[PDB]
Amino acid sequence: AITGIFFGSDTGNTENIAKMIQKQLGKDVADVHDIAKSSKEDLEAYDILLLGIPTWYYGEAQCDWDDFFPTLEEIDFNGKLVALFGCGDQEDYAEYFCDALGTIRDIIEPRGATIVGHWPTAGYHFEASKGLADDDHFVGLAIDEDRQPELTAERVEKWVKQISEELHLDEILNA
Amino acid sequence: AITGIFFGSDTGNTENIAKMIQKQLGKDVADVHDIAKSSKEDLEAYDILLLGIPTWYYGEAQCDWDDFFPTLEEIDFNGKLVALFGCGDQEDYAEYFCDALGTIRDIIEPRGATIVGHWPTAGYHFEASKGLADDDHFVGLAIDEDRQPELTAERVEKWVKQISEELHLDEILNA
Ligand SMILES: Cc1cc2nc3c(=O)[nH]c(=O)nc-3n(C[C@H](O)[C@H](O)[C@H](O)COP(=O)(O)O)c2cc1C
Ligand SMILES: Cc1cc2nc3c(=O)[nH]c(=O)nc-3n(C[C@H](O)[C@H](O)[C@H](O)COP(=O)(O)O)c2cc1C
Ligand SMILES: [Ca+2]
Ligand SMILES: [Ca+2]
Ligand SMILES: [Ca+2]
Numbered sequence: 001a002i003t004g005i006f007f008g009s010d011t012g013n014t015e016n017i018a019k020m021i022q023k024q025l026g027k028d029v030a031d032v033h034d035i036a037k038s039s040k041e042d043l044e045a046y047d048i049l050l051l052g053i054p055t056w057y058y059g060e061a062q063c064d065w066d067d068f069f070p071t072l073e074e075i076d077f078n079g080k081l082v083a084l085f086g087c088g089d090q091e092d093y094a095e096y097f098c099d100a101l102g103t104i105r106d107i108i109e110p111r112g113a114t115i116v117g118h119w120p121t122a123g124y125h126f127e128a129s130k131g132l133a134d135d136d137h138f139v140g141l142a143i144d145e146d147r148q149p150e151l152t153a154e155r156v157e158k159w160v161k162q163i164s165e166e167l168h169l170d171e172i173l174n175a
Numbered sequence: 176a177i178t179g180i181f182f183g184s185d186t187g188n189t190e191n192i193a194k195m196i197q198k199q200l201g202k203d204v205a206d207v208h209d210i211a212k213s214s215k216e217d218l219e220a221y222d223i224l225l226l227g228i229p230t231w232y233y234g235e236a237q238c239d240w241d242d243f244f245p246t247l248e249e250i251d252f253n254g255k256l257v258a259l260f261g262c263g264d265q266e267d268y269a270e271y272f273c274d275a276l277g278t279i280r281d282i283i284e285p286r287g288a289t290i291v292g293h294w295p296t297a298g299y300h301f302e303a304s305k306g307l308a309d310d311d312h313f314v315g316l317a318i319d320e321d322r323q324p325e326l327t328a329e330r331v332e333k334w335v336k337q338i339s340e341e342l343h344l345d346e347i348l349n350a
């Protein structure tokens with residue numbers, strides 16, 4: 001498949017988003033992988049990567065992703081298209097809201113990743129986040145199953161539609 | 176007092192150890208501070224520091240210490256003597272046992288700290304630790320209240336006695 005979805009998850013929320021995204025892109029278009037069982041080679045096997053990472057323990061990367069970080073740093077993302085997604089709690093962790101999105105961005109961006117999927121901070125109620133691209137945009141899709149679960153369906157659909165356009169899955173696959 | 180004990184604690188175990196140490200050394204020899212309520216100056220004020228830090232979320236520094244790290248990195252430890260102590264769970268986190276001891280050591284040692292208080296790994300059963308000083312010594316006192324609470328009383332007493340000798344408290348005060 002042209003797209004490789006790699007995720008990390010402790011309670012299943014980001015695991016579910018990864019599967020919602022694949023279901024929307026079609027399993028023929030996207031492969032789903034748990035970073036916990038993944039290799040450096042798995043990521044290098046795709047030129048379009050969708051990385052899902054929730055934030056835990058006050059601004060930390062999900063443990064499995066944290067374990068993989070030294071390996072991710074060895075990869076060259078120059079020539080690769082990457083979109084980011086992850087979950088967080090904007091009420092209990094208002095000052096660490098989806099920080100991991102910025103942490104992983106800090107790894108793949110300097111290494112060449114062409115990132116697509118920036119998402120507006122509008123509609124969210126948080127105080128601080130390391131996962132911002134600019135003043136009013138997260139660097140990727142921020143999902144909150146604890147405080148705004150009612151908005152997940154709508155959020156995933158538009159973001160997937162959005163990144164398909166930015167990735168041009170229309171042309172790459174058939175045009 | 177000449178000795179400043181700075182601890183960070185989530186469930187109070189490291190706080191407990193900090194108080195045992197102060198009590199054994201005597202309040203007139205050591206002060207106790209919670210890192211979450213301390214400033215850069217609070218630490219700089221001492222030439223003998225005992226830093227207590229438990230390891231959480233798979234090898235991560237206790238959240239308050241983690242928040243303080245940037246500040247800790249801008250402290251000159253040249254001329255200061257330091258001892259490290261902390262808690263961990265060697266069974267549920269055998270691959271990350273007391274990793275935070277190594278993490279804080281990695282910050283202070285390059286910044287000139289003279290570390291005392293290395294502790295033998297004998298009697299502990301874990302798979303990996305970033306808190307090692309060498310093959311068979313942790314860089315500081317490792318306490319396990321979850322799996323080896325029956326060893327805590329003696330471990331602390333012996334370690335306090337050890338660093339007292341290493342620090343030369345018998346002389347430093349009036350000899
Ligand atoms: C102990 C704990 C700490 C958390 N820390 C953070 C945090 O620092 N920042 C954040 O945005 N959300 C935080 N969260 C919320 C989680 O990221 C959220 O529940 C998410 O949906 C988990 O995704 P997962 O199932 O993929 O692991 C934390 C959750 C718990 C229970
Ligand atoms: C969810 C969780 C994660 C933990 N992660 C680690 C770890 O990575 N390494 C370790 O040695 N101990 C780990 N522990 C054990 C704690 O460090 C230990 O219980 C310690 O006594 C807590 O000290 P505190 O009370 O000062 O915060 C963890 C405990 C829990 C509940
Ligand atoms: Ca943190
Ligand atoms: Ca609501
Ligand atoms: Ca970790």
Ligand SMILES: [Ca+2]
Pocket residue numbers: 324327328
């Ligand atoms: Ca006890």
Ligand SMILES: [Cl-]
Pocket residue numbers: 059060061066103
């Ligand atoms: Cl992190």
Ligand SMILES: [Cl-]
Pocket residue numbers: 234235236241278
């Ligand atoms: Cl850390």
Ligand code: NA
Pocket residue numbers: 037038039042
């Ligand atoms: Na694999």
Ligand code: NA
Pocket residue numbers: 001045046047
């Ligand atoms: Na491929």
Ligand code: NA
Pocket residue numbers: 059060241
């Ligand atoms: Na951190």
Ligand code: NA
Pocket residue numbers: 066234235
């Ligand atoms: Na880490």
